[PDB]
Amino acid sequence: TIFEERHLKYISQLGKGNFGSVELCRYDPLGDNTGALVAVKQLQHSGPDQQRDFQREIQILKALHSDFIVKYRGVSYLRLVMEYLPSGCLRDFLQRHRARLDASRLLLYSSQICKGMEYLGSRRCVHRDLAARNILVESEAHVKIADFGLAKLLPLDKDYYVVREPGQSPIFWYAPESLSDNIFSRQSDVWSFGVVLYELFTYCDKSCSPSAEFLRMMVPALSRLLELLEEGQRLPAPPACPAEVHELMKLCWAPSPQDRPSFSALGPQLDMLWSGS
Ligand SMILES: C[C@H](NC(=O)c1c[nH]c2ncc(Oc3ccccc3)nc12)C1CC1
Ligand SMILES: NC(=O)Nc1ccccc1
Question: What architecture is domain 85-275?
Fold first, then answer.
């Protein structure tokens, strides 16, 4: 649980985002290159607000225990040590392996992500950055939610959270209430899950990505996106998308957070489709 810094050997950068970076390191206390590989998050550079956020992220991740959430391994004193999943993120894995991954498998990943989100919700955790680029692949048939850099715990007496600064993530995964009023909730994570189902079923192809679709659907982009959403415009069904999968996405994109299903209602539905595919 406590890793000594001198034993963590730097290999490469894995990714970066919201003021943090994740490195691939070997935890190599013998110094002979035989130790296990780990992913180590740290701030990219120092700053006291980032620091306080980072401490909370660590406390959140340490207290999450799910097969569908990336595993906390410990800390180094300033760094968060996590399991390293060499297949990397689901966005990349989908683009590389599309020819091999059928509808059944995408429904399997969808069910696993839903089940991880159901668990997060039970912990009063709003993830706030759900997207295929932040889901990791453990094996061919197992994914895990990662990137808790923006995650918040809801107080016991309130089911939403208002953020003060504007968001910094690609705008096409945010719910309308987040776009307009910086409100985030478990039901805003359901909106984002609908976009994740869209990514899965397009295999993260860049030409039909959420972003590419907006510049086709056509004043600042954020205001334009909100007007398009208020008018009831949505991303079109992915090529060859099963009808029932598309209906589920549209339900996740109900205008009113209270009309979106919960992850507990979504889960059984995905399983039934997975069993019926
Ligand atoms: C960069 C962040 N990654 C993590 O926090 C990771 C924690 N363990 C990992 N194992 C492999 C892996 O592989 C990669 C490599 C490149 C891009 C994404 C994941 N990334 C991570 C973010 C995805 C959640
Ligand atoms: N959720 C949803 O349908 N979002 C959207 C719509 C148009 C363009 C980009 C994203």
Answer: Orthogonal Bundle (1.10)
